[PDB]
Every structure is written in C-alpha cells, then in structure tokens.
Design a protein around this ligand. Structure first.
Ligand SMILES: CCCC[C@H](O)CO
Length: 230
C-alpha cells in the first residue's frame, strides 16, 4: 500500500538530517512513556511506514529514569518502577507485533540497555559535564524536563500539579539519559547513519544545529519530525 509509504510527511531538523533521511539507512523510532500519542495503532503506523521506507528500523523505549517522571509527579518509588515496567512491556508488545508483521527483526531497546557501550557512556558523560558546567545547556535540558513532566501529567490527569524546580531537576535525569541517542544514536547502535524520529520539534536540537553549544550531534546523526496530513 502506497498509503502506508506516504503515512507521514517528514520535517528534518537540518539539511544534514534531510540527507541522512533521504539515504534511508536507518530510522530510530522514539517511543515516549506516559504519552497519549503512542497508542497501539500509532506505534503500528510508525513501524509500518518505517518498514516501507528504511533499510533498517530500530525502536527506542524509555529506560529506568522514566520512573523519575512519575516520582516528580508524586508517585512513590516502587509504584513508579512497577508502572514503568508495565508501560515498557506494553510499548514492546505493540512494537513487536508490527515489526513481526513487516518481517523485520525485533530490534527494540531501552535507553538503559547500553551501560556497557562506550559510545553511549562517553556521550552521556559529555551531556552531564555540560549540564553542570554550561548554564545555557542546563537551561535547555530543564526545559526538556518541563516538557516531559507536562506531557506525563496531562496523560496521567495531573495538570493540577505545579511544576517546581526540584521536580525539574529530578525529572531531568530522564532527559540526560535519553539525550545520547539524540546526539549519537547511529554510532551507539552501530549503523553508518540514522535519524531519530518523533512527532514534536526538538528545540534544543535547533540550538545545537545553530552551533550554540560545545555539545554537537554526530555528523552521521539526524532528527526528523513526522507529521500526518490528509
Ligand atoms: C525513550 C526516549 C524517547 C525519545 C523520544 O524522542 C522522546 O524523548
């Protein structure tokens, strides 16, 4: 079906991201936890479209720091850990279904699956260094934390909770743990090049692409926004 091939219109972060996208080497599908967008049918659309368009497809699920999102919203730690595991198992099941249907390898990971990967750890250490040492970079990281907390609360019916600094700093551990895949996902995984794909703009990525930080995306790493249009 060519309806499936055209299921999404692609908006690249940069012209470099567009070239990586048009190379079609690899797409990494970012599945956010505690986000109403990622229903079973949406995850199916993502993988159906990706399987018809890219040579290699990988799905990225949230790792352990996803519990920090729930904690910052009040959830006690063991209930939060339990709900993360249920959320991740749900994402995995829906992702596995669609990949199996497309005759694709079940290439699904969490961002916590790479603690013995040198690329992940070195990029993570760079992210932490500049979070601590560059207030400009820290401010952008905390804004990403705000976005993740706002989206979680709305999807869990908690827009009545004010978002404080200590909430932001607790949740930003989620942001820092996922960012190495924004910056170097292809090199972490072992592909020549890759685009991380998501449905919302990445404003910190726009600043990185404007040369505003010592933090850089890898030359073989891009970011694309997927939109659906009639
Ligand atoms: C599991 C990490 C999700 C990545 C998405 O782009 C949202 O951060």
């Amino acid at each position: 079906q060519q309806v499936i091939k055209d299921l999404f219109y692609v908006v690249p972060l940069s012209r470099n991201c567009e070239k990586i996208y048009k190379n079609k080497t690899h797409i990494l599908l970012g599945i956010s936890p505690f986000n109403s967008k990622f229903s079973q049918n949406y995850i199916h659309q993502l993988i159906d479209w990706s399987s018809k368009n890219f040579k290699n497809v990988t799905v990225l699920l949230a790792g352990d720091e996803a519990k920090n999102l729930l904690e910052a919203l009040g959830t006690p730690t063991t209930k939060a850990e339990r709900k993360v595991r249920k959320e991740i198992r749900r994402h995995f099941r829906f992702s596995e279904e669609a990949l199996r249907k497309n005759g694709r390898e079940i290439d699904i990971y969490t961002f916590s699956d790479f603690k013995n990967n040198k690329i992940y750890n070195e990029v993570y250490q760079n992210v932490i260094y500049y979070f601590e040492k560059d207030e400009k970079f820290r401010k952008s990281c905390l804004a990403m934390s705000h976005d993740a907390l706002s989206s979680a609360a709305k999807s869990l019916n908690m827009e009545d909770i004010e978002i404080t600094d200590n909430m932001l700093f607790h949740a930003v551990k989620y942001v820092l743990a996922e960012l190495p895949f924004f910056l170097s996902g292809a090199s972490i995984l072992g592909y020549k090049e890759s685009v991380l794909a998501y449905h919302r703009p990445w404003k910190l990525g726009e600043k990185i692409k404007n040369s505003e930080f010592y933090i850089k995306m890898s030359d073989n790493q891009g970011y694309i926004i997927l939109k659906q249009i009639n």
